[PDB]
Design a protein around this ligand. Sequence first.
Ligand SMILES: CCCCCCCCCCCCCCCCCC(=O)OC[C@H](COP(=O)(O)OCCN)OC(=O)CCCCCCCCCCCCCCCCC
Lengths: 156, 119, 70, 166, 177, 111, 87, 12, 459, 72, 92
Amino acid sequence: HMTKDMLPGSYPRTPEERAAAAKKYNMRVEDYEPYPDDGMGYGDYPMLPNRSQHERDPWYQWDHSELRMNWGEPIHWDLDMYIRNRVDTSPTPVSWDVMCKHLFGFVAFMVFMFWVGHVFPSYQPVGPKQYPYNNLYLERGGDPTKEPEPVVHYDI
Amino acid sequence: GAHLTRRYLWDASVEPDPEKIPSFPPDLGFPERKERVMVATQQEMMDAQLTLQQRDYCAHYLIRLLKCKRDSFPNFLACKHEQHDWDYCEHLDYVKRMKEFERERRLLQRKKRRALKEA
Amino acid sequence: AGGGVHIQPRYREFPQLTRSQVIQGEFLSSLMWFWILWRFWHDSDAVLGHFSYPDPSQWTDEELGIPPDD
Amino acid sequence: MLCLGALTTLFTAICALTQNDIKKIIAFSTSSQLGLMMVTLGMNQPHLAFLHICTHAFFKAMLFMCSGSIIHSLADEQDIRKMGNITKIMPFTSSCLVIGSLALTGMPFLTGFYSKDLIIEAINTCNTNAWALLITLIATSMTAMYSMRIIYFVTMTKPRFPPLIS
Amino acid sequence: AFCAPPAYLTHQQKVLRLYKRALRHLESWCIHRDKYRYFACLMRARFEEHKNEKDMMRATQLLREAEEEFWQNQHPQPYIFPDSPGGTSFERYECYKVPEWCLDYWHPSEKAMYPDYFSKREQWKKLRMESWDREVKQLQEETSPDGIMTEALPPARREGDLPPLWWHIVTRPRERP
Amino acid sequence: MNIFTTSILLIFILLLSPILISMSNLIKHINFPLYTTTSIKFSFIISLLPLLMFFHNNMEYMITTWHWVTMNSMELKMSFKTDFFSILFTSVALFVTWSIMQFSSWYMHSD
Amino acid sequence: DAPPLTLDGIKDRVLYVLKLYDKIDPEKLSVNSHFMKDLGLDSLDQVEIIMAMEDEFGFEIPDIDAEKLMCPQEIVDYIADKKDVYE
Amino acid sequence: KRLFVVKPSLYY
Amino acid sequence: MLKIILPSLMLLPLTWLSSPKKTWTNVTSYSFLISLTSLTLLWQTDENYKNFSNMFSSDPLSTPLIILTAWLLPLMLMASQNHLKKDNNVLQKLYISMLISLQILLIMTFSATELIMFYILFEATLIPTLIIITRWGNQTERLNAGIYFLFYTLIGSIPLLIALILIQNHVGTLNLMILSFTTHTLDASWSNNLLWLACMMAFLIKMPLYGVHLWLPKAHVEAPIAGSMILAAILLKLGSYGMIRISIILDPLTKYMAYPFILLSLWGMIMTSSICLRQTDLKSLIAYSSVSHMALVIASIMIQTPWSFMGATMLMIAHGLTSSLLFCLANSNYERIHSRTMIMARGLQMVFPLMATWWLMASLANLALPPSINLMGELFITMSLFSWSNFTIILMGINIIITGMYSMYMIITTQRGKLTNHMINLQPSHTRELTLMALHMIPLILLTTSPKLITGLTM
Amino acid sequence: KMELPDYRQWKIEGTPLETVQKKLAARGLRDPWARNEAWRYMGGFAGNITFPSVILKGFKWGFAAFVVALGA
Amino acid sequence: SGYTPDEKLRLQQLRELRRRWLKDQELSPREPVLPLFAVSHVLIPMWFVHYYVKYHMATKPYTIVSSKPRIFPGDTILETGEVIPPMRDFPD
Ligand SMILES: CCCCCCCCCCCCCCCCCC(=O)OC[C@H](COP(=O)(O)OCCN)OC(=O)CCCCCCCCCCCCCCCCC
């Protein structure tokens, strides 16, 4: 039912072609900004803003409710990614850099402090625990035949 | 703890290293110090299935507790004297392990005093 | 509003409470406190501990094998 | 694991302090307690770690169904901000909530106390990272804090729930 | 959700829609009602002043510095209602909102019970087909001269006619199934 | 003490019983929420019997119920251990489950 | 759990709240009475009214659908239509 | 006021 | 084994001679019983394999398949009764016969002693398949897909023809029994290093390797459901069966001549698994799932450790059944939806409650849920691969995480979420659709109870 | 039909809203929605709830129970 | 703003129809036209299990193995008759 003229074609070279494609895709001729011509296949597919369906007005009656996309509006190339499930480009109260630095700062400080810790551990004023026999040589599964160098522990 | 401060701050020359507590000879300062003693026979423990770790010099009071816990089964609140005993034995062991640590500490100090005083 | 429900809704008023709701609530809490008090009396070794820490700094040098210098 | 258990304990606990969702705060507490459970396994104390697993199950289960009661009784409000004075409106759950809250905070002679302080003092007595030892203890104070956050906002405050009450 | 989106936003609706986000993001920081009912009538003051600025340029310079003041003084976890987009119950009950064109493939046994239900359903389906013609024609006869076109649809304007395109705003799966 | 082994195998059979009732047409006729709540209740009591055994005697049990494949050197078999970790947890878990299913009936009412 | 609303119980609450707003006289509030042309309130007070209603009935009247809750009645059918009350 | 609950045909 | 075969041939007379109205039931009912006769081969009761006669044999590796090949003909004929029910009564009897010949040929290929009998029957299966794909293919591109399916297999096939005639001269008979009990040890020359590639390459092509797998996505896309089931369940596994019986000879070279393929497959497993993650056509995603889960197999039929081999035998039979199940349910959505797009048709469980349970179990079979032969299979290939080099877990570890993601995404965006507003209303499920599924999974549940039967030659 | 308490009943005096009312007033401002927020503090829920009160709920009988048991 | 006088009638009218749809959704009386045990599933399952555990498992080798029983000092061994020696006296 779909004519070849109503399906994607080659990079719009002349300006009339750039305005013909914009009709095919139901866009405004001044908003059709073909993906850059570097021959990676995009073709004439419009380069729509890289914004996820997450911040599409959540109250409006979107024809396709869950894709928050209307019927006819040009679909984004990566809508398999900026969908309401997979990825979320949506504004955040804290700036992104501020986020990346803070998070990793925390991580680093922690990791480091943990290192300061291993250097200076906390250990009570207690000497080593003393196990009977030869540090349970035989029972720790030691060889019955070969007796071990006696390890003795004295009182006080 | 504060002992750590003595070692992490100040000087660690005279502070013991936990990894080597009996750092000095066992008999230094001792007129034939009596060694320790283990009441339970290796077999007694092996028959009471005491976890290796729990085979301490208090293994003997433990076996008692465990005895009074299997016996007296429906009543889990009545083997109370037995637990105090075990614990005591162990408190009286922790203290030892503390006396040994303090003795080391002091002895290493002896070295600093003696060696330096030798200089 | 059919009277069939168990209890009625209230508008801007303190919801009426059933005797059981209050008694069961005070019951569970009071047993919590009876248990905490009963065990505290019978077994007060939760804070204190039944073993006193030795002062490691009062051990006569004889006690530890500190051989008098020289 | 002693190290990562320790980081999760505080990391999750600090996050819980400001979370305004009742179910979310309890869930973070689920993670923080298991962080303590991870710490005991890391300090090679397996038997006590299992003991906390059993005691952890009783009280955390209580608090979540306690909030289940509050959320269902209110018009499905899952936010501490709009929920208040449940203590007078619903003493039965509030009583259950504080019993659970104190168990979570290791109130003396309650199920948390028998297993939890064994783990705490285990830390205070073993040879361990200094950073791990300090964070685990303040993690314990935070557990009391967020526990306090829930009862103050959810139970002891003027009601802020929607006006019709059912 | 019901009415259609306007093309561009006015100055007003942008200001008056901050008064909502702002006051509603002030009830997250200020939870207790009193503190709020206080710290908020102080907010209106901010909007109350600079109400009669006639200098548009200025007005759009107070608005653009208001929404940046706000962005940096917003609560990360505001109070968004339970059933609204972004909420906790949003679209929860949608697993039970079947689309009503599915009762048409029911086995004659199933529809045997529930008898009067389908007697009224067949009436409504007669209503729908009985007006599609007068509707679409209306939708068209009233196509204003080609030009601006908004998603607003016309009312009835004649007795017996049913508001054009009414089968899915009426007959919409009930909210809480 | 078969009483021990049978009990450990039995909890699984009793809990699986609600699962196949829903597979057959029988659940429409009886009440599934009430029936399931009761059987977990009985499972908790059944779990208690080994728990007392362990405590009385502190003994464990490895139960190899069914063989699945010899696979040459590595034989594979279905084995349930009954060490302190397993039976202590089994009792605690079912008590919590018995609590929640009754809570579930009230919470999801109208689902 | 709670009982479902009615087209006259969703109307008594809407009039109730408004009668508690100091600016709106409580004896000239009538359901067919417009907020800005008949009662006197300004534009900022419409936002405040709607918000009260959003907190009396516990749901959010979207912006675009709430820039028009003028009559003190539109609020009573819009709330009901959004909550499926066929009376 | 029991209300009819639309459901996918469930005989098949 | 001429009961699994002669009675099969006779199916052809029955599809033709029978009444137009009764043609479908005679054929489907009879091949169900044809499968029952096939089950007799499973009665081994001893190590010595079963050499029925000079040309026909069945050993542990072939037997688990011959039964699957006989089993799917019933199912294939049940999944294509809808489309192909709009035909002229002589186009049907051709499709039914085409499906019948595939298992006649495939049963023999899997049950063949002489390796060139494998080749002649091996490459014959393309004729029936190409007709099924090209003649009844819905899309404009099946002429192209058919070309890809014929040339990739054919260019690989003529090298194997030269190689097998070559070994016959070198050894003196292509009889798999003898070739096994005779000393054929290649000598690591440069030439042998080519022989090995000649024999394995034809098998590696129809078992999509990362380098040459583009034929399978294109073929299954436009192929009718019966052709897509045959390609995934039996056709691709023809390549695996060949690699198991042909590497008995060429014993020394694969120790060092396999690295290229092994790395191609394991990296291929990751990339093929990943592109499943964002592919809009559902049949496309299942096909790449098939490439990745078959890339694991060529990496176990090359490591050549006992566990690999039966990991392979477990996975091939298991993935065969699972893939069809996925291709069969994909078709049921395609016929009502009328589009292959994954994004449309969201929320089906709301409207097709059970098909969704079948979808869920198929996905759990697709990913490795543990009480399933699918997991046992991967667990074993994973083990050996680890033995080959402990690092392999990293790559066979990125695949497991990705495999979980795409398997559930198929369930999450096809069988959950809000219902599509008003696509052509989706008529309820037929009982045939559901059985065609039940017939796939009930055997998957039964085989998982006793995995020993599909464990391979090694164990 | 459910009735609704007389709107008049609500008044700001006697509740924490009144003190907020008086200060906002110094500023010249007056909040008009206070009365709506009155039933929060108006009655039943009027009493301030103290943190010891919740932690100590039932302590009175709990100790009463303890003493008795300790006696027997 | 305020509703447009031609949108307060498309909401006027369509709301009127929604009210009728929801009335029609209401079910008429009769609408739905349809045309101790505890021991049961605790005892019956049990007999079977026991049958299985005492006559298959028990019978087969190494199917139900148990940690040795605990034997303490001074407690008798029933099977052999020996009496575990009492332990060395605790001095403290
Ligand atoms: C053969 C090659 C491949 C052919 C593929 C297509 C064949 C189709 C036509 C033939 C189908 C039947 C023949 C093939 C399957 C035969 C299965 C079988 O015979 O079961 C044997 C089993 C007895 O077990 P047995 O192996 O004797 O005991 C071993 C003891 N060590 O007997 C039984 O116990 C029957 C039990 C029935 C119910 C078992 C349910 C168990 C479910 C466990 C898994 C649950 C989770 C599954 C997860 C799946 C996820 C997708």
